[PDB]
């Protein structure tokens, strides 16, 4: 993967406001900001790569900025951060992860509890919410994830 990052960074704050102000609310998650664990992935690049990770996310997972950026977030699904696309996971609910894949595919809001692993191998239940985000074009370009231990 050779994910390319937006020169000048991402409008994370504008996105947080966009989400809190959405008229549709399938999933209600209340007020949110940059102090929590969040990540932004690019739906328009190969394998939906992470293009931004908040400091809380890095801390929570134990990974560094350079170890997460450019990767699909599924790596958290294994204690060694090793997971092949479409492979059958040995510690995660197959139904759960397919719910995520299909939600993302349809730009549909979704919330799940999924087993993940910190860089040091520590297991945890990740209370995950994923919401599609429109860029200045007006259509869905990214997805913002909110992770909760
Ligand atoms: C903004 C954002 C944040 C995210 N944050 C996290 C995070 O913190 N932690 C995390 O773990 N993930 C996270 N994800 C999810 C991850 O990046 C993938 O999107 C998710 O795992 C689903 O896609 P996949 O490519 O892994 O699916 P696949 O690799 O295709 O795997 C699907 C699995 O489901 C089963 N399956 C698939 N289809 C069917 C079917 N039709 N019937 C029965 N079984 C089936 C299979 O056995 C397979 O193993 C995030 C995604 C986004 C967009």
């Amino acid at each position: 993967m050779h994910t390319l990052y937006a020169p000048g960074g991402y409008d994370i704050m504008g996105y947080l406001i966009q989400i809190m102000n959405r008229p549709n609310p399938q999933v209600e998650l209340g007020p949110v900001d940059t102090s929590c664990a969040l990540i932004l992935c690019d739906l328009k690049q190969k394998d939906t790569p992470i293009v931004y990770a908040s400091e809380a996310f890095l801390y929570m997972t134990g990974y560094s900025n350079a170890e997460v950026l450019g990767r699909n977030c599924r790596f958290l699904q294994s204690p060694d951060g090793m997971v092949k696309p479409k492979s059958t996971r040995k510690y995660v609910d197959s139904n759960t992860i397919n719910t995520m894949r299909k939600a993302i595919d349809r730009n549909a809001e979704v919330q799940v509890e999924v087993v993940n692993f910190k860089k040091n191998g520590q297991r945890f239940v990740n209370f995950l919410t994923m919401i599609p985000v429109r860029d200045e074009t007006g259509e869905y370009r990214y997805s913002m994830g909110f992770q909760c231990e």
Side-chain angles (χ1 to χ4, degrees):
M1 221 132 282
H2 306 87
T3 302
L4 249 28
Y5 307 107
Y10 300 85
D11 191 11
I12 301 307
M13 274 172 26
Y15 294 154
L16 289 169
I17 292 176
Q18 173 185 318
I19 292 169
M20 294 192 266
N21 285 280
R22 71 192 195 292
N24 20 342
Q26 287 320 124
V27 171
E28 100 267 320
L29 49 70
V32 62
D33 65 354
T34 68
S35 67
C36 68
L38 70 83
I39 60 174
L40 188 79
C41 298
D42 198 324
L43 294 166
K44 259 47 191 184
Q45 286 193 64
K46 146 113 163 297
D47 206 24
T48 320
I50 295 168
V51 293
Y52 166 88
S54 75
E55 291 205 58
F57 173 81
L58 298 177
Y59 173 54
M60 177 185 85
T61 66
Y63 290 91
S64 78
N65 226 303
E67 290 163 353
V68 305
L69 261 36
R71 280 75 155 196
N72 178 278
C73 208
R74 75 170 70 75
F75 71 90
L76 289 170
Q77 288 159 30
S78 168
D80 41 43
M82 296 304 199
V83 57
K84 36 266 97 166
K86 2 244 57 44
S87 62
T88 299
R89 275 63 143 186
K90 63 252 301 178
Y91 306 120
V92 220
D93 187 298
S94 293
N95 174 66
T96 286
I97 45 197
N98 184 57
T99 294
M100 293 187 272
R101 176 172 147 292
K102 296 194 298 190
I104 297 156
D105 277 0
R106 301 166 172 53
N107 298 320
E109 304 182 6
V110 78
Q111 230 163 200
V112 306
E113 284 185 61
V114 60
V115 179
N116 279 174
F117 301 89
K118 299 185 175 182
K119 174 172 165 53
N120 68 181
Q122 181 209 128
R123 165 172 172 140
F124 72 104
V125 192
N126 187 348
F127 174 38
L128 173 75
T129 303
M130 298 176 284
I131 304 153
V133 180
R134 306 173 180 288
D135 64 1
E136 296 276 353
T137 295
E139 44 200 36
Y140 293 123
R141 172 57 189 282
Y142 310 95
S143 177
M144 191 164 279
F146 299 83
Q147 291 82 8
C148 309
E149 222 182 311

